[PDB]
Every structure is written in C-alpha cells, then in structure tokens.
Homo-oligomer: 170 residues x 6
Amino acid sequence: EKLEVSHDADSLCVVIEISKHSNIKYELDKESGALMVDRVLYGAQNYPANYGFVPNTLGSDGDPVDALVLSDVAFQAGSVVKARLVGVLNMEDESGMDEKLIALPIDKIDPTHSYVKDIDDLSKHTLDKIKHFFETYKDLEPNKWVKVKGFENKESAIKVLEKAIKAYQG
Amino acid sequence: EKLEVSHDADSLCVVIEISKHSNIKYELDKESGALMVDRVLYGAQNYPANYGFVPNTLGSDGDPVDALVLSDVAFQAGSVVKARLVGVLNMEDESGMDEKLIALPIDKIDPTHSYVKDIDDLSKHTLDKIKHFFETYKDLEPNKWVKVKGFENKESAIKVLEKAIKAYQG
Amino acid sequence: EKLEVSHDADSLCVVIEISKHSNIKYELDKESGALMVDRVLYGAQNYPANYGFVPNTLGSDGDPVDALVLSDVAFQAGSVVKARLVGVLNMEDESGMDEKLIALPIDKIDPTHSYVKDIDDLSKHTLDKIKHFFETYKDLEPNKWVKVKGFENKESAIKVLEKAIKAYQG
Amino acid sequence: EKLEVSHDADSLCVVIEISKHSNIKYELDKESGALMVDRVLYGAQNYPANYGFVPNTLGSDGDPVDALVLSDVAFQAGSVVKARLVGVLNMEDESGMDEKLIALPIDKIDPTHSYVKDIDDLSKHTLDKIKHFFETYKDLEPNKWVKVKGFENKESAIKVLEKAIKAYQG
Amino acid sequence: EKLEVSHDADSLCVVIEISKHSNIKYELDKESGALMVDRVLYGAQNYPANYGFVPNTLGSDGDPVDALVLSDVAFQAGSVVKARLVGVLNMEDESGMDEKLIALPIDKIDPTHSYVKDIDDLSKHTLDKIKHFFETYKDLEPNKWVKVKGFENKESAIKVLEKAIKAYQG
Amino acid sequence: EKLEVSHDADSLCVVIEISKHSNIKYELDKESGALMVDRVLYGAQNYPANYGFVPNTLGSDGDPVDALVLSDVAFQAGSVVKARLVGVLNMEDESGMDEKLIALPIDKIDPTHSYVKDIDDLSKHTLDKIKHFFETYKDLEPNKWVKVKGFENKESAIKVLEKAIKAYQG
C-alpha cells in the first residue's frame, strides 16, 4: 500500500490512524498494511484531533514521526490526507522525549482554517485542550505517563520533519 | 413539570441533565423547567455515565443531591429514570465537599447490570474512569478544581440520600 | 404542555416518545409532562420507526392510541409531528389486543414518502421489518409476548382512530 | 416554561429549536411549550450552526427575532443557552425581509471562540457556508426562496435586538 | 487489492469511496490502494447516497466510471458492494460532460428497494435531492461548477457502462 | 495484507468484519483484501458485539473460524484486534453446525472486562442478547435459519480453536 510520499512541509501527507473524537487508538502495521487496534483509552476521553504519522520518516522513538491533523471533521482511520505544518508539540513520556507535529489539511482539501499560518494562530482553547489531553490520557495506564513541555512554531516543526526525513534516508 | 417523586433507595427517580458520552453539561431550572446549557467541557472529555439529580432533596451545596446513572446506553437530557443506589462518590471542589450518588436503572427498565448489588460489584475499570473524569474534567477551568476522596458502599449512599430528603422537608 | 390537538386522519398530530433507530423506549407522563424512561430493549434491536401516541384519544388498553411515524429521519423524543394515516398494525400481547396506527409526516413537513397513499404502497421489506420487530422485541422480557396478526389499510385505520377519539370524549 | 429572559447583548439567552448538523427543523409552540416538527430539509443539507430564537422579542415577521448560535458542539433542541452577539445576517425570502442574529455562547459556558469579538473575526469559510446554506436550503420547497444580502457587525446586531425588544414591550 | 471485477449490469461491483450522509469525499489511489482524502465539502451539505466507482472501466474523464449506490444505510469508504443499475445522471462541470450511474445493492445483499426496477421507480423527492446536491455542492469551490441535465433510465445506463468497459479493454 | 498471525488462546488476533451496533455485515476477501458488503440485516437489529474471524484457521464451514469480540466500543471493520478466549457459542443453521468463539480484547488493549475469566463471568443479560440475536437475525431471510444450542466455557473454546488451526495446517 504505502508507496507515494510527498514531503513538502506545506504538502506532506499524513496517514490517519486515529479519527477525531475517537477513543480507540489504531496503529498501522506497515508490513501487513493491517490497521491494528493498539488500545482503547482508559479514561472518559477522546482525541482532540485526527492522529496519524508521516510515512518515510524516522522519529525520536524509532517509528515514523507522529502528527496531529486538526480540522472540524474526523477522518477515517487508514485514510491519507495531504496537510501542512503550523507547529509542533514537545512532550516527555516513559519512553523518552516525544515530538508531535501539528498540521492542517491543505486548502484544496479543506480551507476552514486556511487563516491559520502559524501555531499562534490556533485559538488558546484548542491548544490547551490538546495539551491537557496528552498530559492526562495516560494517567490510568500503569507505568505510563506524559509531561508536556509546550508548543513551538512552524519554523521549529519544519526542522523536526526534515531531521526525521534524513534519519530515514540513511 | 416536576411533581411525582419516589424516594425509595431501590426505586428513586433521577432527572437526567447530562447523557453518557456527552461533553455538554445541562442543568434544569426547576422554576421554568427549561433545560439550561451550563457549559461545554473545556477538555477532550465526555461524561462516563448519565448525570442527573434526585428531585425533592437538598444536597450539601444547596441544590438537589446529584446522582450518576450507570448503564450501557445514554439517556436523553430532560428525561427521568427510576434507579437504585449502589454507592456514592465523595470528592472536594472549590465550593466544598461534594457528594455524588452512584445508581443504576431499576431492572424493570434495564437489567444489564442487575448483578451489581453494591459499589464493589462494579468493575475496577469503570470506577477508575469515573474517578479520573471528575479529578480532571475541571483542570482547564479557571479557579475551579476537584479532589476525589473515593467511593463508599450502598449503605453509605442510603444515608446520604435520606439526609438529603429530610433537609428538603424542613 | 399538551393542549393543541388536531384530529384529522390526514393532519393528526403524534407525540413522539421513541425515535427511530433508538433502543430506549420513553413514555410521556401527561400529568408532569416528564419524559419517562420506560425501558431499554433487552435484545440487540432498535425501533424500525418513530414511535408515539395521538393525544386526546383512548385506545384499547386505556392509554391514548399508539402510532408509528415512518420516515427516513428520527424525530426527537418529546417532539410533536403532524402526520397522516396510511394503515394500522394489529397484534396481540400479554395485556390483550393491541392496535398501532401506521402514519407518515404530512407533506408540508416531509414529502419523501408523499407517494405512499395506502398501507400497500409501503415496500414489503419495511412492513416485514416492522412486523418482525414487534413479534420479537419482547422475547427476552419475562411474562411478556406479542403475536402479530397483520396490517390493515387506511380506511381501517381511520375507524380505529375515530373510535379512539369518541372513547375519550365520553 | 419560558419565563426568565435576560436581554443583554452580551448575555442574552437563545432558545435552541434546531441543533447543529441536524436536518430536522423544530419550532417551539410558546403556548404549549411543545417542540413542534416544522419540517425536514428537502435537500442533502444540514444546519451550519445551532438555530433558535430570543424570547420576549418581536422580529420583522411577527415572531421572536431569530438567532444562530455558533459553536463546535450541537445543542439539544428545546435547550436554552446564554450567548453574546457578534453580528447579524440580512436576507430576503417569500415572506419579506428576514434578520438572523449571529451569536456565540457566553464564555462561562464555552470559550472556544472567545477570541471572536465581531463578525469579521469569524473565518471566511464559516460565513460563506452559512450564507450558502440559507441561499439554497429552500430551493426545492415550492413557492419558497431566499436571497441573502450579507452580514453586518455587532453594533448593527445590537440595534436589531433592541428594536425587537421594544416592539414586544408595547 | 482490486482484482475481482464482475461487470453484469445487474451484478456489477462498486467501490465505495464516500459513505451516505458524509461530507468527506474520499478517492482511492488504485496503485497504493490507499484511501485518499480528496476534500471536505465547502458547504453545509452531505452526500445523498453512497458514492463510488466501477473498477476496470474508463469514464468520460479518464477515470473509472462513477456510480451512486442508493440505500437506507451508509457503506464504509473502501468497501465494495455488488449492485444493479437503474439509471444514470447526466451533468456538466468545469472539466466537461460527467456521467454518474445510479445503482442499488443487489437483493441478496439488501432488498429494501427491490421494487425499484427503473429510474422512474425511485421517488421524486430522492431524485430532486440528489440532483440539487450535485447542482450546488460545488458552488463555493473557486473555478468549479456543475450544470445538471437530468436522469435517464436503466437501458441508457447499461450503454454508458458497456461503453466504459470497452474503453478500458483497448 | 494478512500475514502476521498469533494463535495463542490468550493472545490470538481477530480480523473485525463487523463493528458492534452495526447492521451491515462485511466479509473480507482474503485474496483481494477487499472489504466486501455481504448484507444489510433484514430486521430492525444490530450486532451485539464486534464480529470477525481468526486468520490461518479452518472452521466447520470451510472458512476461517468465526469469533465475536466483546467490548464497550465498536471496532472498525477491517481492523485487527488481539483478543483472548472466554467461551464459545454453538448453533445450527441451514448450512450445518456453526461455532462462534466468544472473545475479549487483551488487557494491554482494553481492560474493561479483565475480570471476565470464563463464559460464566459475562452477565446473563449479555449472553441472552447475543443468543437471541443469532436465533432471530435470519428470520426474514428466505431459506435461512438458526437454532442456537448454547454456550460452552473457555476450555471448550480452546479445543475448537486448536482443531481449527490444525485443519488449516494440513
């Protein structure tokens, strides 16, 4: 399946593994292309946005860099969406430092938030909800935890992405 | 509207103001009978059960004692359901000590959890989810907070209810 | 609340107590106007249509004559809808002979099935689903049962309605 | 039921008759307090926001002034929400000139769009969707039509509201 | 993935890319088999039916002939459904003449509309909704438009299909 | 796609073809990996749990042994979930004797029912609903029927699974 990849920070594709408002976390097994049921959120929570990963990249944890795709609608898990970066969320968990790219679907797809140029263009409310979600969505999971540092603009996200792309190429 | 009340701990009625899986907290204005939109949860959360109150009772905060109605389905806000007590959840918030009765719809209505005789019959998972919800659903709300103490069996809940009924009668 | 009633067989109003696709059966307490949670279907079923009753009428069981409002959408329980009769479903349960009027919302409201003039205009599939639902939705409920006889055209339904209206007037 | 009214442009209450994403248009019969099913949208559409009316006011068409309550969530029809004005949408239909207030729930309820101070703060996308909805949601309804003029800021909306309040008082 | 194709006008398979009531338009990348997020409807609309394409065919626009699968339920995007033709919808857009086959799932799958033998058997309401959807679902999309001509019976649809099958074979 | 299989009775994987509460029965075509729409339930019913099959096994009917995955949430059709056995449901249909494994997702995925060690740990209500579903979900389907025998503990299910695994290996 996965063989297409576009890596432009303003036209990079994200593979949705989790849909917005969903409490079921899926994970794609690149070899089988099979959508795996990784887990069901322990608490009365649900993802604040569409969750996925950028293919052909290597993040800090050995897996392709993760990315959250913000929008009013929830994309189907297993679907792919061309998006653009606007920032990045830095946090720390039991495994180590974790980086999560903040993206929005490209305008030719969905222009509801075309006005969002950088991380600071997203409303305060949304950022707090997302940050609070990650800071607590693993509270009830034994020997698991998260400590959110904060967000960083688009320029910072591009570097995370580019570094993740090179790591996969060598 | 509200004029019917049954107060038996095994056949008391609860007025649903919030449906399960909903992130919108409603509140009934007894005088108008109008379903009021109290607030939309700040975080990416949703109620772990149906939320309502027992009419003709007076809780610690001056309002009718609150009660959570557990079940697999979500009841419509504004609807009334005959339930039975199985326990009570004790917590503390910015306003003071808060008590929330834990109930289940009576069997002639829905017998999915008829096997649940006491608080300890509910699975550990469910109790942790409910407790975690209340312990965090007000994190992002300025000058608001909650500090959950724990659960107490049915015998303890009956006393809370009976005390709440007498307080309203005098 | 309830004080408005229109009784024309082609413009009679139905008070929705159950929405289509819902497994939760509500019942309106005319005195309180409170939407009561009567029960949650024991089996893996859901109503094949919107369920309600015609106000100011007296059916065979002492309660206002029941009526099913067919349409593609599900109406909110507690809402009222002006409909027109097209037939009636005759069945027998533990309480006795039961009659359920088959109606459709008036065209100025929803004209999706304006072509349905009589019971025989509804597709075979829909009629079997509705009949099968009632014939089994009470299988798991102790000491409760249903034995569906069949459907009868519009002319037959009008007589059921008119008889139900007179019974309430005297 | 309806007896409470707050009329401050920044704390006025709206009675929701239609929930966001719903294709079923409800209408409240003030006398009965009964939620009436006015109609089901003829086309493959759904309201771009929560639709309701401000009580104790008299709009251009003889009924209480209408108002759209924008938010990410859909409020239950029949519920009441304290909101604040940010603008107004002017249009023309078969009945005459129609005015629809554009509002947002007050922050103590839902602060997702607290940053929206005036009509021009809402994204272009949202305004076009709302305008396009009204400009076409009545295309298939015989002898019915709409011709949207445009939006007007908050200062303009306040005057519409205040004029609607006085009209009801005399 | 795609290697199975049945081409009988009464047993041809359609690959669902869009589910009924959905506002998210997906598109399958035959090479990757990856479900692509093509776009989110600009207006407050949603598809009047399941949308997909017939594999191993070549339509007027160079892509496999499109087909709408009508039914009461919404099929999951990426799923395949054996259907039968009943007509075809002719329209014109910025790209040129567009043809969209009107189909229904075969009876051994879903017999709700088995009575529909030809395009004229579908209710007027449904046809107008579908036609109105296409005539306006691209209004807000810059440099894009649609001008619906009308529907044509089953005999006409078979010719469109057969012509689309031959075009792919040579 | 399908090439991964784990066969431990406490860590065996199930390929979800039907999600809980869904009335649409999907079936995976192992060769194409295409999710096929097998049928839409004739009656007003919906699956009491997630339905799927264990890959690399051969059941009594020539197809991989079937298994129901119980949980509070509905898994997406086409997704895979690691589960554990707790029992088996024996029934008879027009094709012959049918066996359906009763499983629960492994705890590292979803521990809501970790307390369920054997078939007898599941509530009576749930078992009756599941049994009643299968005993009637094919009533309206011509020349099709089911006659449920009953449930059998985990030890019995393991033998069914192991026998199904060997049958596929030779």
